[PDB]
Amino acid sequence: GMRVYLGADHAGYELKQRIIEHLKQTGHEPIDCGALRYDADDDYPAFCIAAATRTVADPGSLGIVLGGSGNGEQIAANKVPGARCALAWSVQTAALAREHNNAQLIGIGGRMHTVAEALAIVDAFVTTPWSKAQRHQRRIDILAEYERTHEAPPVPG
Amino acid sequence: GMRVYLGADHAGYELKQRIIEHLKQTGHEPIDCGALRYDADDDYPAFCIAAATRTVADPGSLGIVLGGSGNGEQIAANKVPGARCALAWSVQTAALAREHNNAQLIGIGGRMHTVAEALAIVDAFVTTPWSKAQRHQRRIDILAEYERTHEAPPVPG
Numbered sequence: 001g002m003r004v005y006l007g008a009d010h011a012g013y014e015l016k017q018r019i020i021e022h023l024k025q026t027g028h029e030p031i032d033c034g035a036l037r038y039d040a041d042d043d044y045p046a047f048c049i050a051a052a053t054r055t056v057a058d059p060g061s062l063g064i065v066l067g068g069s070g071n072g073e074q075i076a077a078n079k080v081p082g083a084r085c086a087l088a089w090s091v092q093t094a095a096l097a098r099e100h101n102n103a104q105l106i107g108i109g110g111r112m113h114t115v116a117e118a119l120a121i122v123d124a125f126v127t128t129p130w131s132k133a134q135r136h137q138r139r140i141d142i143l144a145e146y147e148r149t150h151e152a153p154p155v156p157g
Numbered sequence: 158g159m160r161v162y163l164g165a166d167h168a169g170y171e172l173k174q175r176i177i178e179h180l181k182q183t184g185h186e187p188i189d190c191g192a193l194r195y196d197a198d199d200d201y202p203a204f205c206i207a208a209a210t211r212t213v214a215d216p217g218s219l220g221i222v223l224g225g226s227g228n229g230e231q232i233a234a235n236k237v238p239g240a241r242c243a244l245a246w247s248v249q250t251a252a253l254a255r256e257h258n259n260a261q262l263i264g265i266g267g268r269m270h271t272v273a274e275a276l277a278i279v280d281a282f283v284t285t286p287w288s289k290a291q292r293h294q295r296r297i298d299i300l301a302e303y304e305r306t307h308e309a310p311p312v313p314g
């Protein structure tokens with residue numbers, strides 16, 4: 001049973017309600033960071049930064065941010081210190097997000113998939129374990145060090 | 158004509174060389190940030206941080222980071238101040254990245270597409286204009302203010 005913080009604007013609102021319902025029925029614990037109602041003009045960043053911030057402050061938790069394409073949403077979540085948000089557009093990329101990138105969050109576009117395709121992406125995200133492989137941890141540590149100092153590391157040749 | 162900064166690890170190296178050749182033949186000026194040769198054990202972060210840094214500091218330029226899925230790469234590019242890197246997995250998401258998110262960069266997974274599909278994603282990226290619409294600019298500005306102060310903007314209600 002995984003804890004999952006969810007964020008969404010209007011474009012990903014309806015899909016977010018289906019995912020919250022799906023996560024409850026599969027033994028997980030969804031927490032809604034907003035939007036709590038449909039509002040056609042609302043802005044995605046605040047909801048994505050809310051979910052990503054709360055995910056980082058609650059180790060072991062995961063996160064899902066929803067928009068039209070999911071791309072503005074993953075960009076916003078990646079600005080949060082300590083957060084790593086992949087865009088999942090398939091079962092494979094959702095699983096590789098966990099296995100290789102140790103991503104605590106994923107973006108998904110509600111306008112890009114059917115309900116059944118989006119829920120299969122969510123399943124792979126919340127069940128695929130992080131591999132802990134040496135090369136993957138090494139890359140995560142290099143990026144985290146850049147996030148600490150904002151001093152770009154030298155390219156290897 | 159546009160300067161386009163490209164970064165890639167071993168997983169996106171062979172596709173990066175193909176994209177550099179395609180950009181030369183379509184009137185653009187590709188600049189290789191690395192890797193310059195195939196090294197199977199090299200790490201993506203430094204190449205993506207270099208491409209994203211140089212893109213943001215160069216007005217009118219774009220950038221492309223390549224990997225296996227492209228997700229580790231866009232995550233690294235998104236840690237750079239000012240950068241906005243979408244994950245492009247189709248012609249629609251490459252075009253929407255420009256139109257809606259004003260993304261200076263995109264990540265592409267070399268293992269996820271054929272060569273022909275990936276080059277069509279690049280074509281949509283470098284030819285789709287930034288819409289400059291009010292709501293799109295407002296959301297970019299909310300996120301840039303969060304980058305500056307790290308003050309999470311309040312959720313409506």
Ligand SMILES: O=C(O)[C@H](O)[C@H](O)COP(=O)(O)O
Pocket residue numbers: 009010011012044066067068069070071072073257258292
């Ligand atoms: O894809 C995104 O990041 C946004 O959800 C999308 O740009 C919203 O666009 P709108 O619904 O305002 O046309």
Ligand SMILES: O=C(O)[C@H](O)[C@H](O)COP(=O)(O)O
Pocket residue numbers: 100101135166167168169201223224225226227228229230
């Ligand atoms: O897609 C990525 O994030 C990386 O390019 C990928 O994890 C590299 O893994 P490797 O090629 O070392 O298996």
